[PDB]
Write a structure and sequence with these properties.
Chain lengths: 213, 213, 151
Amino acid sequence: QVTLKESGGGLVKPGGSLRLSCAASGFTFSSYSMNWVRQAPGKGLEWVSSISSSSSYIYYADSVKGRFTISRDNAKNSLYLQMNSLRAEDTAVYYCARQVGATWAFDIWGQGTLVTVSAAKTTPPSVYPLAPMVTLGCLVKGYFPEPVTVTWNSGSLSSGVHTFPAVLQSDLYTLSSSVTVPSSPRPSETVTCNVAHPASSTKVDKKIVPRDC
Amino acid sequence: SVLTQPPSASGTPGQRVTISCSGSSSNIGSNTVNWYQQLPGTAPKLLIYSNNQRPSGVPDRFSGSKSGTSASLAISGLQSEDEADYYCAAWDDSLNAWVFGGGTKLTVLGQPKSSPSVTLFPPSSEELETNKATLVCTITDFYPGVVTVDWKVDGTPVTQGMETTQPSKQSNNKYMASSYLTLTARAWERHSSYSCQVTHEGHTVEKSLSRAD
Amino acid sequence: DDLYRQSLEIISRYLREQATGSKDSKPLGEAGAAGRRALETLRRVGDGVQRNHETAFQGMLRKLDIKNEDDVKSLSRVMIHVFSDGVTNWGRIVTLISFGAFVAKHLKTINQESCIEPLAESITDVLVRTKRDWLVKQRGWDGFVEFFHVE
Ligand SMILES: CN1CCCN[C@@H](Cc2ccc(Cl)cc2)CC(=O)N[C@H]2CCc3ccccc3N(CC(=O)N[C@H](Cc3ccc(Cl)c(CCc4ccccc4)c3)CC1=O)C2=O
């Protein structure tokens, strides 16, 4: 399994610094040029930086010159991006991509890591039940920054789930997730949503109990 | 962006759609073009390398070509699963940088229309205890992915406090969206009739409730 | 020119070890970890070129009739024919250096050992002077290692 996994993304204040890390697995890392490519939410891909196998050739986009520093530790199968003097425009999902030696194609990409450049503070979400086949849900209210993850019954309920995108009110995100189950939300047959907000180390379970309406 | 692409592209199932990528002599004119497909909510993946080569797993329907400073991606037999953002990328000799195109959002129109399944949720008691009231309107299983959401409180159209999510793609090629109405707990108590109205394709689906549960 | 230096180091090292018949263990003082990897790839690729085109290399060596310093000086006019047609790729560059090694091997046996260094700088001369932009674009000796990586 040839993989790339980015880390270090999170909330940082304007003018601040952050270091992104990317771990390579299943290949000879020291024989590849590597790249950083970023994407502002709802916007296009923007190549950030490139570093050859022995770090002899390094390149940066003009938008990042003098502020970002790419480097790699071949002994630790790691690629880094030291970002300094961060501004609102640097808010994006940052991807790590392996470059093919013979064609320069970016054949392997990581899943990405979100960097939010804001003065707003880390806020944990408030999880509320959404009770009216029957559609149940939970409202994940007033968190910051993104992301949050929602599962149902610790991942054992995946059919019929709809996790909607978030909306941004003032400086707080709200999202909801719904689940359609058979016509019996029986006390023995429970429906629980599992909400995680890694930025605030929140791990909340919320059992959805209906009322006669 | 240095490489230009039409912001959007569309076709019907089975049609042949073409996405162009326009560059200069120092990028497309000097180098090979690669294409990336970014499915909704996923990391980009290699689609085409060396102008027209397909990595293992990319179906025959995708083909690419290059002439002068332009490149093209051809998708024969358009399918709803081809709905994604397509990006071309080429190394630029005069910039010493990778240049990605602005991206093309591909929409597959003319599939069989589906009405939205609307579910309305009142605020939870737990949320009312914080002196806030959120009504959640879930909209799923609709095609095309364009909806209008209007809120009514006691027969009068709501003008403030509403937030609708942009439509998002489901696994079965249909769309989903979410709407929120935020009131104070006092305002929730002061009014009784709440309605979320969803308009799709000159046809509107309404779900309503009374606080008198 | 650090690239001229680094290429000269790798090429002169590869040609000297080829004439000797045995590979060294001592470090490279200019090239670095980039040079180590570059020389290692050149040893694997270059030897796989020298074997796969052994008859053609034997024939070219016979036809060239190299026996003195004047012949070694004129070998630069033969080296450019690897780029004469306007074609530049790592496949041509490795062949240019692999044959350089074959000639160096011949120069040692015909006891013209002192002419190996002149030859190594001549190969480096044709490479770095006529193909600088392409080498730099291709990420020099790192790109060379990345291009031939198999996995
Ligand atoms: C004027 N021309 C020809 C006009 C140029 N057009 C070429 C284009 C080309 C060039 C290279 C390659 Cl790999 C593939 C294609 C056609 C060609 O040469 N095809 C090749 C096909 C097979 C072959 C494979 C490997 C090596 C040689 C081959 N040989 C045998 C040969 O004798 N080739 C010479 C040219 C040549 C080619 C490669 C090398 Cl390394 C050298 C030696 C330089 C040197 C290096 C170190 C020390 C001293 C000298 C010379 C013909 C000539 O004199 C061919 O003929």
